[PDB]
């Protein structure tokens, strides 16, 4: 019915930041908007209503603007509280969300450590090999990992997981596991992770021979 | 100015259905005098356990 | 203040159904309508059904209409969500929520959310874990820095638990959400960095436990 | 099927009281409420109180609140009016009704009335009706037919019978409504018209019958 | 306290007529109201409520209609057992009854037969004198009766009594009485009851000399 | 068909408050926006007040803005019209109207007219006529034909009757329209033609009447 | 999915009045507006009346303003038309439809209509109907090819169905859709071309069934 | 009162066409307008809104376009079950349709067969006579029918009856009933039916002798 | 007519508790819901609670809710009141009252008041008053006139009554209202006036009476 | 929490004056409005019900008027009876009391007679001074009081009382308590008040000196 759309997807700030981000809908929704909170692995927790009415108990650093279909919501000063997800919501006809801002903290560039794992002789005599390509400490989160078996790139048989942002450092954590049957591991000898970022001005590549 | 004083009348004709969900606090709080004044045939028909 | 407590969640097959509460405290549950909203990773937020303060009026999504149902028992002061026919994309967290007071003629939305309970939809038995070690070696070292790890692999349901050393060591565990794969067995990844001058002579083990199968596996990892 | 039959209506004197009841027959009684109503020339129907099936609500006009008090004694199916300090304008026909069987949540009205009780509230006293002819002469005579007749005047309570030749004489023949006077006293008309050609021949005696008070006069009309 | 009203307060119509009355409310009632027959000297019946819905065993020829403050009963075809008097009534907010309309059997215009009666020698020796103008099988009930003393109309000293419909031709017979001291009646000479009626081209004029 | 039916006009002191009320029937009154139009001998007509059908709306004149408030009472189909601190220049009558219905573009007025209520304002008190015979002589004769009549002059408030004869005479007469005087005093004459040579033997009585005093005077108007 | 049955149509009298009742399934009937929709083949479709989803608006067209009156019973999920004073253009088939679901500003119609009741308004008596042979010959042959047919003459109600040889013969059957006559009586052939070298020796008979009047024809159709 | 008007009120179209059809309103109504199907003894359906909104599960290949005054349904590729009647409705001030457009399956021209009976001697017993002509599988609908009673024409005294298209070959069949009192129809000898069609060069004549 | 008494109401120290009644008669009490409403002269008048005539639904002031428990005895007919958690603010006069009779559709209020019951919240112990005397001289007289008195400082709580001769000196006398000091003892001054010829000569005897400590003090002021 | 806010907060009227108070809501409220007197010492009783509605017993020269968010009540002719003090209450969303307005005698001016009391020797024993400054018998209410004391101004140690309307002659009287440490108090040596009142051309001030 109504379309939502949050900009942008992720904001990297810092404490003390004027954050301000957007929301559209498809069409007309008048003043029908709200604004939610959400911190990780917790329940979401009411903000602004009527597009600019302050809920009680929220501090007056938030604050909200908009009409039609254009809607802004501004942090003054980001506090060490506020880093969490953001959702705006129409009510003007039935309820529908965007897909959530999340506020992410600005640090320094941190290049990623790259390590790699060869699947354990139990796991191979399990009949499945499953090789895992690490990038440990590293911001910001957008890097790019490639498997690459004896020069060729794989596509369709990796899974990426990535953790959220370290409490000591604000640095992410990627791990990347690339899954073959025992027959296929061992139709090869060469395998790669080759991992880019912005902090690396060549590509890293790990890799290993099978058997080895 | 001289707008329309009348209904559309093609308006909506079905709920909001955003409309109010909760219980209005200034409702009837008076016993409606027209209501069901007979004994109700689905009622409690055994003994309660707690009576005297 | 306002409380709002959610049970019955869990893992059910497709097709089969299952029967969601939520109970309220902190407030005059009779006197405010709710709402039942899923959160689940692919859809992100997304409203499922809403109930006035009586029951007169319900409504609901055009992906659940037919299926779901949404009820009360003012006298439990109680919420229910009975869904039936269920499919793998119905898998998400629940939530009841409960409506704001406004005015008369405004528009509702809510604003105290529940705890939330996690339904996940899935034809997948109950299946212990594989622990299998992610062994340190010279291509895993840089400088006096190593690091080693855990794979827990082919698991179901939700959730494992994965510890080092009963606990003792945690500075640089670095455990990664699980993911679902093709087969609907989750699988994850923990990990740590070590003094390279330690390798061969501390002993590291990975204790996992998975409470839904009573399944406790202690993995020793060894460098090679 | 259902009955109803009231009884305790007669005449009284302002200030004093008096008690109606309605006995029920034909259905169960003790599970419906009932409606006392009364009707007047004055002001038509009007509703006077209602009790529910186990007397715990009682409601009453806002004319007659705090001077009548309705009850029922279900033991002996019995519903009951009691009536103080009666004022002048409550002389009505009363009857008992009986609320009608609906839905839970519909608004309730009488289905089956009684049959009704006179209540005439009067100060005046019991008093034999003065009898006067009505002779017919060339002033009341048009054509072939003249019209003769009796007054029956200043009596009270009410009611009178008129009769012309003890029954026998019935074909045209109109007894008035009676009307009640400023002096309280009730006063009526009973008319006859027969051929001019029998007048000073055929005898014409109007009897008049009060049983209140036992009076019976057979007064003769004669022409003039 | 809600007024009803009913339209017309007095409706002559005929066997096999269409039949439809009127019932208004002061203020909005919704559904709740009933519609009651009575016939004279009898109890009440219940015929319809909730507006529309017929009672168990009234026939099929009356219906009615209407919601909110306006509300109407038709009878299709009218039959002899219908000449009664009905009333509606209210109950949204306690009970109102209407005024209650009554369906007159209709005929052909019939004028009225009149005589006067002089008050009788032994009334006049009581201390009283009623002289009686008697209008005798008329139709429709609607006609007026002025008393004349000595070409003086008179006012506040008559009372008037009607018939109800005779059953074997639907005319009506009207009464008035004339009540006067004997002092009152001795200081004139010449009393006269004037008759008027749709039915007469010309009023009627009965009167008498005193004595005579 | 459409009907409107005002009422609770009359004579108001200046500086006190009214309420004028206008029952619809005939159409759907809450679907349809209402006017409030005056029409006096002095301005003519003159549009007064404008609401909404839901009442969201309200206009009113220049020369009333701050003191008239329109409201209306769609739960009981009624139009008001509260006028406070009213001036002498208000005397008129007041119609309640209705907008016609049209396109959505459209500018809108009204098409039915309600019936009218009066509304004087005056400080005058409530006074009978003075009833002076305008007495017929050789100067009121032209040929077979002269003229009498009667002066009904200073009396409070309007309206009052004229009759000649109790009524038995009138053909040839003529009451004029009445005019309001400096004093706030209302005055009027009514003349009849009679045939000359009926003079001194035909009574002549004028029957003035006077409802809001109860005032009824027969003057005998003699030749001199 | 939706659903809709209209029930209560028939053959009426005109003067008299009539029900019709739209039963709604597969949707919450109580929030949501309903239309009123006739179709005739002398007037088309053409709209008759809509109801808010509270009963709160209703409107008409202007050739049954007054006479027809929209209702509905959210707790039974039912919709009324009471139809009093019918003509005899109100013959049509009366579909229920339910308003779609749209913006708050937007105008709106119909987006589900009912399976529809046919109200047929005539002065005609129920009669069964006439059946005359078609009989082949001469001069209905052209070549190898002859026409038969019967003629269904007179009838009312409808409908009245028409088989061949007990239904063993539909190849090549044309039953023509039934014309009302000035009569007010229903008329329609129905037709069969056979090959004319099978004529003298098959039998062909037309089987006329007519079930308001119970009636059962079987005409045989024989050559000249 | 809103006119509405289609056209064309009939188009022969064939399977795979680009059907475009129009319908106009006697004032502005916007976009306020909608496009219905009704197929032969079943109910309409809805199948654009706003002039250019497609209703859910309806087919791509239809659209439609148009505002104020004008509007235009498009049908890009004709389907046989699209063969129905397609109604326009303004509902910009109540509510009304326009005649309705059929969309007819172009064929080849075929000419009518034509057959002719008389009146039974028991419906002539019975007062009455029924003269009927029948044209079997034509195509296309247009055609004339004349009545000639002893080479005069007649007017008022018929009635035509037409079937819809046969599913079989898409033609149509038509009756003619001429209806004539028994004196009336033995008042006279020669009964003809003359009939005209696209696929005919000269006129086809039945008739009858009464008594042959 | 219909009649509330408030009962229970004192002093009580800040954090306690405290239990208010309302007796109800003159009029049904178990067909109307009740409110509870104070006024403070620090806030004015300030709504507190609400009940149903069942006690299913209940409403409290924000600055109230959680500490505060409306309740009600319908087979008493008593209104109830308990106040937990008192804070120094919850100092006022409370009354309950009746919601008037009206539409269903309608909002409601209060149409009858109770006679109200003080409530004090203070930590304060109870204590007898100081009194001083007022001493008139010359630089308390103008012309004719001098003015003496009586201050009453330092007492709780309240009230004190004041006299002058044993109340035979009413005339020009002005007791002021008390104030409450920053120690919470309340303080007033009492003054009269009086001839300037009298001084010396005409006792002058100001008696201060407190019930709740049964304080009697009759302190004489005499010039300097 | 819909605020309410009545003026003027006091108003000086006469018997016979046509009184108008207004009421003005902070959101709109529709029709639901009540006023509500109440007499000093007693319990508030209805006055208006629904914004215009009068309430049985309640007399016709009351009467409502307004909508939306302004609303006044008007007295067409003031009575003795109706001084007394007049709330509105919204009833639209839970129940908000406005401010009050007091409707006050009104009568010629009077100027106030000033008298001043010093602290007795029993208080100078107990601890505490009271120094008492007495206005009696002045018309309108407003006034102003300054302590100086040794021509310094006192602030935050004094407390007033007035009295309400004397039931006599209207007039008002006021007191004036001023409060001091005995060692405060005995720092000084002047104590006067100093007293402004729109009947008084130049300001009052009475004053002694400590120990005279």
């Known amino acids: 019915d109504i379309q939502m759309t949050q900009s942008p997807s992720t904001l990297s700030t810092s404490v003390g930041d004027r954050v301000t981000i957007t929301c559209r809908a498809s069409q007309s929704i008048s003043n029908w908007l709200a604004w939610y909170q959400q911190k990780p692995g917790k329940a979401p927790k009411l903000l602004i209503y009527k597009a600019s009415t302050l809920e009680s108990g929220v501090p007056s650093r938030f604050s909200g603007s908009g009409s039609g279909t254009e809607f802004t919501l501004t942090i003054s000063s980001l506090q060490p509280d506020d880093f969490a997800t953001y959702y705006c919501q129409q009510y003007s006809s039935y309820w529908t969300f965007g897909q959530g801002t999340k506020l992410e903290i600005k640090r320094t560039v941190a290049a990623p450590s790259v390590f790699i794992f060869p699947p354990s002789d139990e796991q191979l005599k399990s009949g499945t090999a499953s090789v895992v390509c690490l990038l440990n400490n590293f911001y910001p989160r957008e890097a790019k990992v490639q498997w690459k078996v004896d020069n060729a790139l794989q596509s369709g048989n990796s899974q990426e997981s990535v953790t959220e942002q370290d409490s000591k450092d604000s640095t992410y954590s990627l791990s990347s596991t690339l899954t073959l049957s025992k027959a296929d591991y061992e139709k090869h000898k060469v395998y790669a992770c080759e991992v880019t970022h912005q902090g690396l001005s060549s590509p890293v590549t790990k890799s290993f021979n099978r058997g080895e | 100015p001289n707008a329309n004083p009348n209904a559309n009348p093609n308006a909506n004709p079905n709920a909001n259905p955003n409309a109010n969900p909760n219980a209005n606090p200034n409702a009837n709080p008076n016993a409606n005098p027209n209501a069901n004044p007979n004994a109700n045939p689905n009622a409690n028909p055994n003994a309660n356990p707690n009576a005297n | 203040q306002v409380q709002l407590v959610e049970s019955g969640g869990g893992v059910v097959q497709p097709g089969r159904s299952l029967r969601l509460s939520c109970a309220a405290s902190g407030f005059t549950f009779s006197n405010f309508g709710m709402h039942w909203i899923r959160q689940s990773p692919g859809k992100g937020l997304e409203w499922?059904?809403?109930?006035?303060?009586?029951?007169?009026?319900?409504?609901?999504?055009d992906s659940v209409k037919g299926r779901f149902t949404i009820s009360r028992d003012n006298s439990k002061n109680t919420l229910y969500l009975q869904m039936n026919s269920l499919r793998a994309e119905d898998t998400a967290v629940?939530?009841?929520?409960?409506?704001?007071?406004?005015?008369?003629?405004?528009?509702?939305?809510?604003?105290?959310?529940?705890?939330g309970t996690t339904v996940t939809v899935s034809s997948a038995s109950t299946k212990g874990p594989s622990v299998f070690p992610l062994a340190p070696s010279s291509k895993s070292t840089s400088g006096g820095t190593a690091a080693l790890g855990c794979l827990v692999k082919d698991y179901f349901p939700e959730p494992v638990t994965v510890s080092w050393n009963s606990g003792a060591l945690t500075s640089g565990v670095h455990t990664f959400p699980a993911v679902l794969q093709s087969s609907g067995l989750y699988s994850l990844s923990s990990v740590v960095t070590v003094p390279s001058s330690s390798l061969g002579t501390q002993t590291y083990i990975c204790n996992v436990n998975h409470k839904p199968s009573n399944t406790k596996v202690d993995k020793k990892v060894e460098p090679k | 099927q259902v009955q109803l039959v009231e009884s305790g209506g007669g005449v009284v004197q302002p200030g004093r009281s008096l008690r109606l009841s309605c006995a029920a027959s034909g259905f169960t009684f003790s599970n419906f409420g009932m409606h006392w109503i009364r009707q007047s020339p004055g002001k038509g129907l009007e509703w006077?109180?209602?009790?529910?099936?186990?007397?715990?609500?009682?409601?009453?006009?806002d004319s007659v609140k705090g001077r009548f008090t309705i009850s029922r004694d279900n033991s002996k199916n019995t519903l009951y009016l009691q009536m103080n300090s009666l004022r002048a304008e409550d002389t009505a026909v009363?009857?008992?009704?009986?609320?009608?069987?609906?839905?839970?949540?519909?608004?309730?009205?009488?289905?089956?009335?009684?049959?009704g009780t006179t209540v005439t509230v009067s100060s005046a006293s019991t008093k034999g009706p003065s009898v006067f002819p009505l002779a017919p002469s060339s002033k009341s005579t048009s054509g072939g037919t003249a019209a003769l007749g009796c007054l029956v005047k200043d009596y009270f309570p009410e009611p009178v019978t008129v009769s012309w030749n003890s029954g026998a004489l019935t074909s045209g023949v109109h007894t008035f409504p009676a009307v009640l006077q400023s002096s309280g006293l009730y006063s009526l008309s009973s008319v006859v018209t027969v051929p001019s050609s029998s007048l000073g021949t055929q005898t014409y005696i109007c009897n008049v019958n009060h049983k209140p008070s036992n009076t019976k006069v057979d007064k003769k009309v004669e022409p003039k | 306290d809600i007024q009803m009203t009913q339209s017309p307060s007095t409706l002559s119509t005929s066997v096999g007529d269409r039949v439809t009355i009127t019932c208004r409310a002061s203020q909005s009632i919704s559904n709740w109201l009933a519609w009651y027959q009575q016939k004279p000297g009898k109890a009440p019946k219940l015929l319809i409520y909730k507006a529309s819905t017929l009672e168990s065993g009234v026939p099929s020829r009356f219906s009615g209609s209407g919601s909110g403050t306006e509300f109407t009963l038709t009878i299709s075809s009218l039959q002899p057992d219908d000449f009664a008097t009905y009333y509606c009534q209210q109950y949204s907010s306690y009970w109102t009854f209407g005024q209650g309309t009554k369906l007159e059997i209709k005929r052909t215009v019939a004028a009225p037969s009149v005589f006067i009666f002089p008050p009788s020698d032994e009334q006049l020796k009581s201390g009283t004198a009623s002289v009686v103008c008697l209008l005798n099988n008329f139709y429709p009930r609607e006609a007026k009766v002025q008393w004349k003393v000595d070409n003086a109309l008179q006012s506040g000293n008559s009372q008037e009594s009607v018939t109800e419909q005779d059953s074997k031709d639907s005319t009506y017979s009207l009464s008035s009485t004339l009540t006067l001291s004997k002092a009152d009646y001795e200081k004139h000479k010449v009393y006269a009851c004037e008759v008027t009626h749709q039915g007469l081209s010309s009023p009627v004029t009965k009167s008498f000399n005193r004595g005579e | 068909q459409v009907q409107l039916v005002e009422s609770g006009g009359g004579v108001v002191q200046p500086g006190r408050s009214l309420r004028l009320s206008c029952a619809a029937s005939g159409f759907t009154f809450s679907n349809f926006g209402m006017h409030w139009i005056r029409q006096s001998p002095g301005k003519g007509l003159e549009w007064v007040a404008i609401?909404?059908?839901?009442?969201?709306?309200?206009y009113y004149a220049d020369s009333v803005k701050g003191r008239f408030t329109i409201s209306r009472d769609n739960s009981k189909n009624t139009l008001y019209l509260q006028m406070n601190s009213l001036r002498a220049e208000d005397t008129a009558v007041y119609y309640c109207?209705?907008?016609?219905?049209?396109?959505?573009?459209?500018?809108?007025?009204?098409?039915?007219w309600g019936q009218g209520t009066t509304v004087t304002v005056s400080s005058a008190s409530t006074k009978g006529p003075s009833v002076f015979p305008l007495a017929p002589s050789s100067k009121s004769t032209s040929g077979g034909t002269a003229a009498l009549g009667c002066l009904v002059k200073d009396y409070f408030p309007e309206p009052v009757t004229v009759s000649w004869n109790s009524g038995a005479l009138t053909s040839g007469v003529h009451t004029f329209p009445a005019v309001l005087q400096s004093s706030g005093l209302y005055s009027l004459s009514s003349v009849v033609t009679v045939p000359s040579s009926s003079l001194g033997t035909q009574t002549y009585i004028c029957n003035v009447n006077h409802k809001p005093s109860n005032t009824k005077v027969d003057k005998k108007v003699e030749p001199k | 999915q939706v659903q809709l049955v209209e029930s209560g149509g028939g053959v009426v009298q005109p003067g008299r009045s009539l029900r019709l009742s739209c039963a709604a399934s597969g949707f919450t009937f109580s929030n949501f507006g309903m239309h009123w929709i006739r179709q005739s083949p002398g007037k088309g479709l053409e709209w008759?009346?809509?109801?808010?989803?509270?009963?709160?608006?209703?409107?008409?067209?202007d050739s049954v303003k007054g006479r027809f009156t929209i209702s509905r019973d959210n707790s039974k999920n039912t919709l009324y038309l009471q139809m009093n004073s019918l003509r005899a253009e109100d013959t049509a088939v009366?579909?229920?439809?339910?308003?779609?679901?749209?913006?708050?500003?937007?105008?709106?119609?119909?987006?589900?209509?009912?399976?529809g009741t046919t109200v047929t308004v005539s002065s005609a008596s129920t009669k069964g109907p006439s059946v005359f042979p078609l009989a082949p010959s001469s001069k209905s042959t052209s070549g190898g090819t002859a026409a038969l047919g019967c003629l269904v003459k007179d009838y009312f109600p409808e409908p009245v169905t028409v088989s061949w040889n007990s239904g063993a013969l539909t190849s090549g059957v044309h039953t023509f859709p039934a014309v009302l006559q000035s009569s007010g009586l229903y008329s329609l052939s129905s037709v069969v071309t056979v090959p004319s070298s099978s004529l003298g020796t098959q039998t062909y008979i037309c089987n006329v069934n007519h079930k308001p009047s119970n009636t059962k024809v079987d005409k045989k159709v024989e050559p000249k | 009162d809103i006119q509405m008007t289609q056209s064309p009120s009939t188009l022969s179209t064939s399977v795979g066409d680009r059907v475009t059809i129009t319908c106009r309103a006697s004032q502005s109504i916007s976009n306020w307008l909608a496009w219905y199907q009704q197929k032969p003894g079943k109910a309409p359906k809805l199948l654009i809104y706003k002039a250019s909104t497609l209703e859910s599960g309806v087919p791509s290949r239809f659209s439609g376009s148009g505002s104020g005054t004008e509007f235009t349904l498009t049908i890009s590729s004709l389907q046989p079950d699209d063969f129905a009647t397609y109604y326009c409705q303004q509902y910009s001030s109540y509510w009304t349709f326009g005649q309705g457009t059929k969309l007819e399956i172009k064929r080849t021209v075929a000419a009518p067969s034509v057959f002719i009976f008389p009146p039974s001697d028991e419906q002539l017993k019975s007062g009455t006579a029924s003269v009927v002509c029948l044209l079997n599988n034509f195509y296309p609908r247009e055609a004339k029918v004349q009545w000639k009673v002893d080479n005069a024409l007649q007017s008022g005294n018929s009635q035509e009856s037409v079937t819809e298209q046969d599913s079989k070959d898409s033609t149509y069949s038509l009756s003619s009933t001429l209806t004539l009192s028994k004196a009336d129809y033995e008042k006279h000898k020669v009964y003809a039916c003359e009939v005209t069609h696209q696929g005919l060069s000269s006129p086809v004549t039945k008739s009858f002798n009464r008594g042959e | 007519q219909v009649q509330l008494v408030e009962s229970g109401g004192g002093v009580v120290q800040p954090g306690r508790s405290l239990r208010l009644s309302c007796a109800a008669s003159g009029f049904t009490f178990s067909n109307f819901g009740m409110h509870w409403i104070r006024q403070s002269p620090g806030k004015g008048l300030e709504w507190?609670?609400?009940?149903?005539?069942?006690?299913?639904?209940?409403?409290?002031?924000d600055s109230v809710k959680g500490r505060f428990t409306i309740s009600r005895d319908n087979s008493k007919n008593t209104l109830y009141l308990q106040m937990n958690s008192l804070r120094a603010e919850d100092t006022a006069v409370?009354?309950?009252?009746?919601?008037?009779?009206?539409?269903?559709?309608?909002?409601?209020?209060?149409?009858?008041?109770?006679?109200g019951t003080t409530v004090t919240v203070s930590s304060a112990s109870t204590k007898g008053p100081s009194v001083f005397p007022l001493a008139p001289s010359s630089k308390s007289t103008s012309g004719g006139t001098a003015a003496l008195g009586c201050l009453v400082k330092d007492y709780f709580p309240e009230p004190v009554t004041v006299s002058w001769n044993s109340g035979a000196l009413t005339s020009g006398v002005h007791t002021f209202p008390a104030v409450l000091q920053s120690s919470g003892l309340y303080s007033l001054s009492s003054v009269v006036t009086v001839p300037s010829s009298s001084l010396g000569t005409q006792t002058y005897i100001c008696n201060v009476n407190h019930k709740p400590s049964n304080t009697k003090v009759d302190k004489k002021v005499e010039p300097k | 929490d819909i605020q309410m806010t009545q003026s003027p907060s006091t108003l000086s009227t006469s018997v016979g004056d046509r009184v108008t108070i207004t009421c003005r809501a902070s959101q709109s409220i529709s029709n639901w409005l009540a006023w509500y007197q109440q007499k000093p010492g007693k319990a508030p009783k209805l006055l208006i019900y629904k914004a215009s509605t009068l309430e049985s017993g309640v007399p016709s020269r009351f009467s409502g008027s307004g909508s939306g968010t302004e609303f006044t009540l008007t007295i067409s002719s003031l009575q003795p009876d109706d001084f007394a003090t007049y709330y509105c209450q919204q009833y639209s969303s839970y129940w908000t009391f406005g401010q009050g307005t007091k409707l006050e005698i009104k009568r010629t001016v009077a100027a106030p007679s000033v008298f001043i009391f010093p602290p007795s020797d029993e208080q100078l024993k107990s601890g505490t001074a009271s120094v008492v400054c007495l206005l009696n018998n002045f018309y309108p209410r407003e006034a102003k009081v300054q302590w100086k004391v040794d021509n310094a101004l006192q602030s935050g140690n004094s407390q007033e009382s007035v009295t309400e309307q004397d039931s006599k002659d209207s007039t008002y009287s006021l007191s004036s308590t001023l409060t001091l440490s005995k060692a405060d108090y005995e720092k000084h040596k002047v104590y006067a008040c100093e007293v402004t009142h729109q009947g008084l051309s130049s300001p009052v001030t009475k004053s002694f000196n400590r120990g005279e």
């Open positions: 609401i909404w059908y839901d009442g969201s709306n309200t």
């Open positions: 109207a209705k907008v016609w219905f049209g396109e959505s573009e459209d500018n809108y007025s009204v098409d039915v």
